[PDB]
Structures are given as C-alpha cells and as structure tokens.
C-alpha cells in the first residue's frame with residue numbers, strides 16, 4: 001500500500017491521473033519524482049521549469065554543480081539528484097526531444113531508467129515541449145517500465161484522450 005490517490009490503473013504496474021506533477025509531488029512526497037530533463041539539466045520550461053520553480057531554483061543550483069563536475073547526460077540517460085521540497089529524490093531522465101531531431105527509439109532507453117526504482121511519480125517522457133506523441137510515449141512506458149509508475153498528466157483533455165485510446 002502507498003499514498004497515491006485518484007489514479008486509474010492501466011496495467012499491473014502503470015497508473016495514470018490528470019494532475020499537475022508539482023502539486024502531486026508536494027502532497028505525496030514520493031521517494032522518486034521524475035523530471036523531464038535535457039542533457040544540460042537546464043530546467044527552463046515544461047515539467048522541468050515547473051519543478052525547478054517549485055524548488056525556488058535549488059534544483060537548478062544543484063544541477064549546475066552536477067554538470068560542472070560530470071558533464072552533460074546522454075539522451076536516453078539519467079541521474080539521481082535531490083528531490084528538494086518535492087520528493088526524497090529526483091530522477092532526471094532525458095527523453096529525446098523531437099524538436100531537436102533526436103531519435104525517438106531512444107525513448108525506450110529513457111524509460112528503462114525507471115526500472116532502477118521500485119515506485120515513481122513521473123510525467124510522460126518526451127511529451128509536451130519535447131514534441132513526441134504522448135499516446136506513443138504511454139505505449140513505450142507500459143511496454144518498458146516494470147516497476148510501479150504513477151503518471152501525472154497536466155492537461156485534462158490529453159488525459160481523456162490517453163485513457164480512451166489505451167489498448
């Protein structure tokens with residue numbers, strides 16, 4: 001038993017809700033919140049900008065130190081950093097950004113990072129400003145992640161489309 005509430009169960013291990021991931025994280029304090037990161041951990045917009053804003057820019061400060069030490073992430077890769085006031089940990093995961101021409105097949109590699117964590121609150125990778133089809137992203141998620149994932153979808157309209165079209 002865990003503290004996630006109001007989720008629709010899609011599969012044995014994948015759950016989905018129309019929610020703002022920032023507010024969801026603030027209430028649940030999950031062990032892991034996933035950020036839709038880029039390789040530079042520049043949290044300007046989308047989910048990343050919103051999560052970082054909710055940390056009063058502490059996520060960005062920590063991220064800049066991480067990059068200065070380690071260099072950029074790989075597309076499809078991840079790193080674990082602090083969850084600040086939102087979660088114990090933040091798993092920064094880099095999905096491919098279609099608006100940069102990145103290979104969509106890397107989306108499966110990105111979701112594989114979730115399997116290193118037993119339970120996660122997450123957005124749909126490569127959705128939103130990353131330019132992928134959220135329905136494809138949901139399919140890859142279900143077919144790749146084996147751990148328990150609670151997906152927050154900010155847009156009510158997209159949420160309804162994702163549920164109604166789910167196979």
Ligand SMILES: O=C(c1cn[nH]c(=O)c1)N1CC[C@@](CF)(C(=O)O)C1
Pocket residue numbers: 020021036045046047050123124127128129134152153154155156158
């Ligand atoms: O991750 C986010 C997000 C969350 N909060 N603020 C943001 O700008 C972006 N996504 C993924 C797809 C999205 C709609 F395009 C949705 O979830 O409905 C937005």
